[PDB]
Design a protein around this nucleic acid. Sequence first.
RNA 1: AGUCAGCGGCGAGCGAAGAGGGAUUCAACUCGUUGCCGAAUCGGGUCUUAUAUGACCUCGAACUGUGGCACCAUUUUUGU
RNA 2: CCAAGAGAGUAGCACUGUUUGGGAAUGCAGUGUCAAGCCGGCAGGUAUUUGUCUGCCAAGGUUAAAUAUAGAGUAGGAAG
RNA 3: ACGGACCAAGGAGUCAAACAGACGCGCAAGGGAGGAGUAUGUAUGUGAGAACUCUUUUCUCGUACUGAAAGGGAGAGUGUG
RNA 4: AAAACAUAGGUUUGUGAUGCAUCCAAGUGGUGUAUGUCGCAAACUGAUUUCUGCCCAGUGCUCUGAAUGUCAACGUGAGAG
Lengths: 215, 107, 144, 106, 203
Amino acid sequence: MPKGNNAIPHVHQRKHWNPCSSQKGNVKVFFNQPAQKQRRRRLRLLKAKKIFPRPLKALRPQVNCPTVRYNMKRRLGRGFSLEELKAAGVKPRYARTIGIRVDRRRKNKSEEGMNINVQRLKTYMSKLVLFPLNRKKPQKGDATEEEVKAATQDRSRYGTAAVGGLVTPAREAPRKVTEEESTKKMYKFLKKNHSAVRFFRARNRRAARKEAKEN
Amino acid sequence: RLSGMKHSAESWGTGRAVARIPRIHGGGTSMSGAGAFGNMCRGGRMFAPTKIFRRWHRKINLHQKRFAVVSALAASSLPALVMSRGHKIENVAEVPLVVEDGVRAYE
Amino acid sequence: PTRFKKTRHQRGSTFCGYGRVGKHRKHPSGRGNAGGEHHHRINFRKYHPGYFGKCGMNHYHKKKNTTWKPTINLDNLTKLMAKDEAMKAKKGEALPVIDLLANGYSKLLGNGHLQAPCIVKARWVSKLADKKIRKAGGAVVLQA
Amino acid sequence: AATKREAPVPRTGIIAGFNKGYKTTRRARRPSSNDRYALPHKKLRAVKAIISDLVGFSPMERRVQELLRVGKDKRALKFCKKRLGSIKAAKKRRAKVEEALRQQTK
Amino acid sequence: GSFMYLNELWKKKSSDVMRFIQRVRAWEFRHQHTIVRLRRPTRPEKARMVGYKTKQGYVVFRVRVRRGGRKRPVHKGITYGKPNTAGVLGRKLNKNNRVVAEQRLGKKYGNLRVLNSYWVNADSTFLWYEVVAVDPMHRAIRRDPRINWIVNAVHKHREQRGLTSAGRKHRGLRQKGHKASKLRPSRRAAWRRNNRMVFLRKR
RNA sequence: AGUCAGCGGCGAGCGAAGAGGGAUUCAACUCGUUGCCGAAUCGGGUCUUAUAUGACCUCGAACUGUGGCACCAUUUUUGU
RNA sequence: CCAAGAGAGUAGCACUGUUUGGGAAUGCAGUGUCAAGCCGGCAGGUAUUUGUCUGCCAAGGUUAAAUAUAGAGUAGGAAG
RNA sequence: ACGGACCAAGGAGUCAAACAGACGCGCAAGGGAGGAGUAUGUAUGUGAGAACUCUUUUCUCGUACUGAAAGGGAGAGUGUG
RNA sequence: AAAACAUAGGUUUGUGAUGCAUCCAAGUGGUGUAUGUCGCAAACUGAUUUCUGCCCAGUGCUCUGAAUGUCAACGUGAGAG
């Protein structure tokens, strides 16, 4: 066979379920994708057209969201926070009618969220049109101005009324350490904090031993 | 899906004076016993059946795809090349011959 | 592509260059992994030493995100940092501000020797920063 | 139960080492009405008990009871654990028979 | 709600008192034919709470199914095979008896839709479940906009697709994510998923 | 992530989830245990009304169908 | 002036089997056994007791849309 | 020793992962998006898996390793005292 | 196509119906048996004739035998668990 020194024994397609003259079977190519893209697209656009008075995206909260790896990150998450919604004031049911999500399984871990959210909420609202009904009095919420939009077409992305992110940026500092930090010990010393917890821990040395040594 | 491949045909084996392949099952047909399944048989499989993932497809590096074009854009006006390109114009003058955008409205 | 393949070069030729000796039909003489221990031993041992057995210890249902990576070392940072800064702050009368998070990471391990005190809003450090940052009058702010 | 829910947890103040990520601003959770969960919703008790009474006991219940009546009371270690399954349950039965008797006795 | 009593009372299975009740039932079935319509449940509490609400279209069945387990039927009990799935009373039987039961009801007529069913009794022999079955043809029922969902195309049976909660039990549905897992897209579907092939658009 | 999860003559061979990004989504829903109750508030039938409704029987239905309420509430709670 | 009305031979446990990558058990099925002071119940991937602490609140009941079509699918395009 | 009476037309080394080298090829501690999604007319169409892309978020792999672990962790700069 | 088998003829077991024998996925399933020791079942021997020894250690079988070696679950009581 040829002599070439290349990257040992490989190549893969010559394995299981690649339907041969047999049959099988677990098939799911992506070649549909153009079409699919279009399927997403063509539809999406076409959808807009239909819906049309409507701002499309439905307001949801903003969150900082998971993990360590995500500990530092925010995403506009699912749902909302009834509590917040409450805090702005708004009947959830009604909110649903407005097209602002709701939730429950947002259990709502901390303060910040409200704060931010009320502003989000508010902001949408600031940017509210609300359509009334004629004959019937605009009134109910005080639904507004017929010509004002143009409700239709630009569907909308809610991000406009209340945007995504938020963070705080920190700057320039001619100083600090001099007050202190150059003494601040971090050659372990500010490891100590962890250390203690580790060390005194359950099956850990400082809780058992010490106590034992004591009696 | 299974082009060719289709008789309940079996290999006849050895002692039978003959190459030992699959052969058509059935009589009268006068396909009766004729070599089956594969490659070499009439109407059969071919060798290597025609696979679904061919790599009809690719990546291209983005920098690279573009970069390339980028060389090309210059060479869209490296005139000799352009002429050489089957492009001719006796007319030839400024390379590129840069034209009014006013033209665009001509109906 | 078809034309490159050896095959093209190798027709009229039986063996496919496999050897006239070795009429190695289309079978394994081996097959997948296994048999490593008898007939492939020397190879196996040799080329993939440390295998099998299992030993040390384990952490079931481990959830690796939770560990997801944190580490940077020093000079590294400055580079991320605006050069203006990095060609300036040195003195200690301007400590430019670095938020680790954007950089990713979380942990600081030694190395580097920098070229301006600055602030790193940093999450964890080796021993060395007490001897580096600190030595530098550069800075760590641990997060809270 | 409400012994588990009230002005909790002013978490503090910085990551790791017994305190962690952020000095909480511990929102007002949990108005969680599923702490309605039985309690002595009086109804439960009332009914359960009537009927409980109405049915008398189980063979076993009595059986263990005997053990008490003597005082083979590490016994039923088994009965309660095996018969009822699990250690809690065991406990649960244990009260359950015992009580009933003890007060029943007066 | 009297059921509150009823229920608890109903928990008292293991007792003499019950066992009277049981016993009569245990002669009654034991006397009785295999599957019977009922003019009402014998365990209303479950029935009503598994949803029975007093009007036509709601049909009651009591059903008898042999309990026990089963043999792997094989002629003459011989397996060639490699060892593994062996034994006369080998493969144990994945589907549940209730489910079969329901299913057998499902098979039993050319109509009924199991709304659900509950066990009522078992003896040394038979399990009894009292089955809440519905016809989806009564004009009142059909009229009934609450339940009419029942009418629809997916309801050309149900029970054999595994639609009771119990069926769904053997069908495995738990939402506890890491005890929810695999079956969540059926058994199969997920298999199809999980053992997918290299569909990579580009490469 | 074919993975530091891992199973496994532990070998062969196998082997996942969570999160993130993301598509799609304004998606969410009932009953049974709460006084529900001045001839069941129901339903089937009938008959009106051009349907409900009206109406009346039937008689399915007080072994309980309605309505109300449904551990997110109701304001918990107390402003009774 | 108070209430405060949430699913059982099921859950569970043993046992067996089967089944799982799921590990001193991922389920299921059979069989036996068989739960709730409600300071509860369920979950929190090394057995346990034991205790906290952390997340939910099962065991009845319905629910587009985004997905599939995998070979044997049918109306009507587009193609290579 | 086998196979080989004759002539047409057939008739056999494929697709393909990670991966090792080689080589061209891109950029370079980053690189590779990548999933998607948006996006506006050429005008069939269009606001191009495939056109053009185009990309904030980044994602993902890469730009220290070592320890079973618990866990740590590199100018132990150089030089210097 | 026989020196084979069948075969009458020879010999023993097993076995009396809530049974024996026996078929069976299962069922109130089957068959022997629409029947009952002059019965059935089961095997061995192979007309008539004539005779058929010794061995029960072995190895089976058999045993209503013994009874306290053993032999599973199973229970039973015993420690924070």
